[PDB]
Design a protein around this nucleic acid. Structure first.
Length: 83
DNA sequence: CCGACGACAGATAATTTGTCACTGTACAGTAGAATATAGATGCGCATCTATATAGATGCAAATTGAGTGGCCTTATTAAATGACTTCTCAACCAGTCA
């Protein structure tokens, strides 16, 4: 989770061996971070990251509330990985 | 004259393609993993074997010292040297003489 956070927050660079034709020009710091109840997220380490970055950790009430995280995963099975 | 079939042209739904709106369903930590077997290979330990004896013994020459057995001219004389044996070893009285 700490590694996913820094890759999300920082400006992104990829070399030509990725053959990208548009830029992932996406960066900057969240105000809030919303998650399932896994021990990665409900942890002192993410609490300390959140307090130092100033973002608030929030808990997902059901799997069916977080479809914005979950649904990237079916699309990738259907558009990428099954092929 | 009446009926049937082919040429050419004309109109038409089936077929295929495209577009558009509504929808069932997967995203939700998760099958590489557990549990037998045979079959080959390697290290360890025991259980023999075959060689290698030097010490002891028996025996058979090879002298070696120590025995034993068999074969031989003689009688007189003389001298020389070395020995043995035997015998003997009185003392004063009586008759002359310068």
């Amino acid at each position: 989770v700490a590694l996913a956070l820094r890759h999300a927050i920082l400006p992104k660079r990829y070399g030509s061996e990725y053959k990208l034709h548009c830029e992932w020009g996406t960066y900057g710091k969240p105000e809030h971070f919303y998650t399932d109840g896994g021990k990665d997220f409900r942890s002192n380490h993410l609490s300390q990251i959140g307090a130092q970055l100033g973002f608030v950790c929030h808990l997902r009430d059901r799997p069916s509330e977080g479809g914005v995280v979950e649904r990237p995963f079916k699309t990738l099975n259907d558009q990428l990985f099954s092929t």
